[PDB]
Design a protein around this ligand. Sequence first.
Ligand SMILES: C[N+](C)(C)[C@@H](Cc1cnc[nH]1)C(=O)O
Ligand SMILES: [Fe+3]
Ligand code: NA
Length: 436
Amino acid sequence: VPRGSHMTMEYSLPLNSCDREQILSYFEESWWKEDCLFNSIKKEEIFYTNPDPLRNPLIFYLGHSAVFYINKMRRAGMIKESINEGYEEMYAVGVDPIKWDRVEEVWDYRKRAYEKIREAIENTSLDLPITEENPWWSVIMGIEHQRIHIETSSMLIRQVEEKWLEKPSGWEYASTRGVNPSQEMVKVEGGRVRIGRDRNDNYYGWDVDFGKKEVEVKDFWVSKYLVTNGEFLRFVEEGGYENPEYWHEEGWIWKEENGVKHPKFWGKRGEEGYRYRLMFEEVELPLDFPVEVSLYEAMAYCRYLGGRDGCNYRLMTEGEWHLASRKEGEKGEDYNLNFRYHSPTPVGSMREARSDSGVYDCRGNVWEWLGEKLKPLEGFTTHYLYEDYSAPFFDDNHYLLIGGSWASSGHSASRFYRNWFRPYFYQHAGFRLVLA
Ligand SMILES: C[N+](C)(C)[C@@H](Cc1cnc[nH]1)C(=O)O
Ligand SMILES: [Fe+3]
Ligand code: NA
């Protein structure tokens, strides 16, 4: 199925038809969005904190997106000179488990990098289509990487104390609409599903997005909504976090070692109702928003709900999501993707985010966990610009996450972007139920 079609809508650049100005605007929108995100931090020294203890300090990510562009475009030949070789080494490699520069210095690197990148986009000969061997792939890779980091850095900043932050002007949250709408299982017809793209696809992809796997999917029942905060509140209030029947050993230990008694972005003080941390402020828990959980917590809720309902629940496979999410004639405006809002939306409230099987928010709103591990597909090959993008993580310890959140833009909002995280890592991410 070609990408960019009525049922494969993409938010990224059509690489067989994008003019220079389209590339420049796509680059600028990404860079300016990242600037805006980092400018939300109103105390300079917060850049030296690592608000997510599993990731580097904010200052690293401030330099990282800029250095990545320079490194890849130099390797592709689009740029000749380095700006700062020391920076281009120190800020090049991220972490998945020094002496930092001053914030002003890193902003200064960004400004110099931005100027050099823009000039290369303005002046370099452009021959369409942009394919993997075309030097321009480094520009597209650089933009798509920055777009991923806007989202991943947003999750870091969400973990910074709100007293050091101010929401950027123009960024708006979605409002709650009230109580969670009633959950319902709906039937998705099975079929033989293709996973993976063929190369020279007219759209960007990462190495792990390309390949061929065909899976026979049986008819299945899936919850039409992502599991909501209101649904999950029943799990919390009924002792789900204290009941070992709902947890396997690995998740129980995680839960105990991290003192977890509720989802990460819920908060409670005394007997007051739960609060909920948006990007930059706390509100009363929005019962109709999708709950944002680790994979462990999603599985624990599945076990709890199966006990209550007298059945078994599990998460979708990758093939199941493609079937559940299929929507002919889909449009970019249908989904809570690409900063349509700067928060999750009430489940179902994006009324055109209903798949052809009646499943809501399969694309957008919050990532959804899958029950399957990151694996390469038949035909997997690395790209010469970035050997270690996915291969280090084929350890059967990373789970797939799919469909994008409100914060996913560009190729990260694609149906065909194959995303992954450790089961204890937090993202703007939820889940739905499958009858097992
Ligand atoms: C594919 N994810 C989103 C899991 C990756 C993408 C990525 C960014 N910089 C290097 N790789 C990650 O954030 O580690
Ligand atoms: Fe990175
Ligand atoms: Na989703």
